[PDB]
Amino acid sequence: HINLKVAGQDGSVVQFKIKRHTPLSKLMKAYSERQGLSMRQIRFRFDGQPINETDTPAQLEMEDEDTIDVFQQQTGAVY
Amino acid sequence: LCVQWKNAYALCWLDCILSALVHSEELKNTVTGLCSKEESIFWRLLTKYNQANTLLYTSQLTSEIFAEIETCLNEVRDEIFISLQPQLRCTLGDMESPVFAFPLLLKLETHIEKLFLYSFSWDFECSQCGHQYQNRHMKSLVTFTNVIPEWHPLNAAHFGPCNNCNSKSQIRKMVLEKVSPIFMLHFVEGLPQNDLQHYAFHFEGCLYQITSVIQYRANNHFITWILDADGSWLECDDLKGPCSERHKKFEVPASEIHIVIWERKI
Ligand SMILES: [Zn+2]
C-alpha cells in the first residue's frame, strides 16, 4: 500500500493509493474515469520508460509518493 | 542529395530522430571532438550516415550502391533500436513515441546529452484559491499543451488546472534559466502558427533559431523537416525512397508541429 501521483502534461497531479503487487491496470482505469479520458488514448511512463497495465509497483521498484507521467497517446508509425 | 532511412515496420518514430540528429551542426562538431570517438554510438551514427550519403552522391553499380546504402543505414538504425529496446520494451512492429525515445537515446552518452539539457522552472499561481509553486527542473525535452495564443520561448505559458481547487484555465509558465546549445520542445497540439522565424529568441546574449521540426502527420506518421543553409527545407519522409525531398518554404500545418528543435547560432 503506497501513494502514487499521476502527473499530466497540463500540470495536473492526482494522487492514488495502491498495493505494491497490485497491477497498475486498476490505477490507469481509475485515472481515465476521473479525467474523462479514454484508456486507449493515453500512455503512462515511469522513470522515463513506458509502463503496461500488467506491471505492478513491485516490478517497477516504485517507492511511495513516486510520480507516474501521463500523456495523450501520440505514437507511430502506421504500416 | 540527402539520403534517408526507408520505412521498416513501425520505425518512423526512430527514423525521425535519426534524421534530426545527423543534420545537427552542433552535434556533428561535438562528435568529432570526442575522446574515444569510435566508442560512441553517436559517432557511429554520424559516420555511417555520412558514408551512405557519400554513396548517394556517387550514384548520380546502381544495384550495388543502393544495396550498400540500405545495409549501411539499416545497421546503425538497428543498433540504436536494440539499445533502446530494453527501456521501451518494444518490437519493430510496436508504435512508439519519439517524445519517449529521444530523451532515453540522449541519456546513453552524457557528453552528447549535455548538448540538450536545459534548466528552467515551472511557475504556477491560481487566481481562485492562491495555490502557487515554482519547481526547478533540468530536462532535454519538455512537453507543452494548451499554449497561450502568444506563446513564445521567452513567454512560454499554457493553460492548466489548479491541483488545489480544480479551477480550470489557470496559467502555468516555463521560465528558462540556462539554455543548452540544442533546445527542444514537444507541442501536443502544435504551435499557434507555423511561421517559425517568429519563435527565434535571444537568451543571455545568444541567438536561438529553429533548425528542424518533427511533423506528426495525420496523427500516425512522423516526418522530419530540416532547414538547409540556403533557407530551403528538406523533408525526410521514410515512405519516399532513399532521397529526401527539397521544399522552398516549410509546409507543415501548425497543428502538426510535434517536436521543435532550436540551436544556438553565431
Ligand atoms: Zn486553485
Residue numbers in the entry:
A (entry chain C): 17 to 95
B (entry chain A): 225 to 284, 296 to 501
Structure paper excerpt:
Proteolytic activity towards ubiquitin-modified substrates is common to all USP family members except for USPL1, which shows a unique preference for the ubiquitin-like modifier SUMO. Full-length of USPL1 is composed of 1.092 residues containing a USP-like catalytic domain in a middle region and long, disordered protein extensions without the presence of evident globular domains. USPL1 is a low-abundant component of the CBs that plays a role in the RNAPII transcription of snRNA that is essential for cell growth.
In order to get insights into the interaction of USPL1 with SUMO, here we show the crystal structure of the complex between human USPL1 and the human precursor of SUMO2 at 1.8 Å resolution. The complex between USPL1 and SUMO2 was prepared by taking advantage of the formation of a covalent bond between the SUMO2 C-terminal glycine (Gly93) and the active site cysteine of USPL1 (Cys236), which stabilizes the complex, increases the binding affinity and thus the chances of crystallization. The electron density maps clearly show the covalent bond formed between DHA93 in SUMO2 and Cys236 in USPL1, in which the sidechain and not the C-terminal carboxylate is crosslinked to Cys236 Sγ. The final electron density map model of the USPL1 catalytic domain includes most of the residues (Ser225 to Ile501), with the only disruption of a disordered loop connecting two alpha helices in the thumb subdomain (Leu285 to Lys295). USPL1 adopts the typical fold of the catalytic domain of the USP family, resembling the shape of a right-hand containing palm, fingers, and thumb subdomains. A Zn2+ atom coordinated by four cysteines stabilizes the structure of the finger domain, as occurs in several USPs, forming a zinc-finger motif (ZnF). SUMO2 is grabbed by the USPL1-like right hand in the complex, with the C-terminal tail of the SUMO2 precursor extended towards the catalytic triad of the USPL1 active site formed by Cys236, His456, and Asp472. Interestingly, a major difference in USPL1 is the lack of two loops in the palm subdomain, namely so-called blocking loops, between strands β6 and β7, and between β8 and β9 next to the catalytic triad. Arg324 is engaged in a strong well-oriented electrostatic interaction with Asp71 of SUMO2, with 2.7 and 3.1 Å distances between the NH1 and NH2 of the Arg324 guanidinium group and the OD1 and OD2 of the Asp71 carboxylate group, respectively. The only specific side-chain contact is engaged by Asn398, located next to the Zn2+ site and conserved in all USPL1 orthologs, which forms two hydrogen bonds with the main chain oxygen and nitrogen of Gly27 and Ser28 in SUMO2, respectively (2.8 and 3.0 Å distances).
